[PDB]
């Protein structure tokens, strides 16, 4: 590394990388709606009896 490499390139640390110690920063919450919900596939029909 010291003798056989001539030039080096440096960039800001990508934010996607994360050390193993900071694994709790990856904790996140996702919400799924209740399974009792029923989604209608039938259209509404409009009528009058007058």
């Amino acid at each position: 590394s010291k003798m056989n490499v001539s030039y080096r390139l440096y960039i800001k640390t990508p934010a996607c990388l994360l050390p193993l110690s900071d694994y709790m920063r990856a904790q996140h919450d996702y919400v799924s709606p209740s399974s009792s919900r029923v989604y209608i596939k039938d259209p509404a029909v409009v009528y009058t009896r007058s």
Binding site: P43, V45, Y47, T48, R49
Partner: protein, 50 residues
């Protein structure tokens, strides 16, 4: 002893349809002389015939 009253045929005030019904006019003791309700194909999600 002799049976004077043991149940019998019982009249019902109204019948209740357990199936969904299309819109309609009166066709019982009252008969409607007007045209039956016109069914129009509207609120089409995708374009057709235009």
């Amino acid at each position: 002893g002799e049976i004077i009253y043991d149940g019998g045929l019982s009249s019902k005030l109204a019948d209740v349809v357990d199936k969904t019904t299309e819109p309609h006019n009166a066709d019982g003791a009252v008969k409607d002389g007007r045209i039956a309700p016109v069914k129009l194909d509207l609120e089409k999600q995708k374009l057709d015939k235009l």
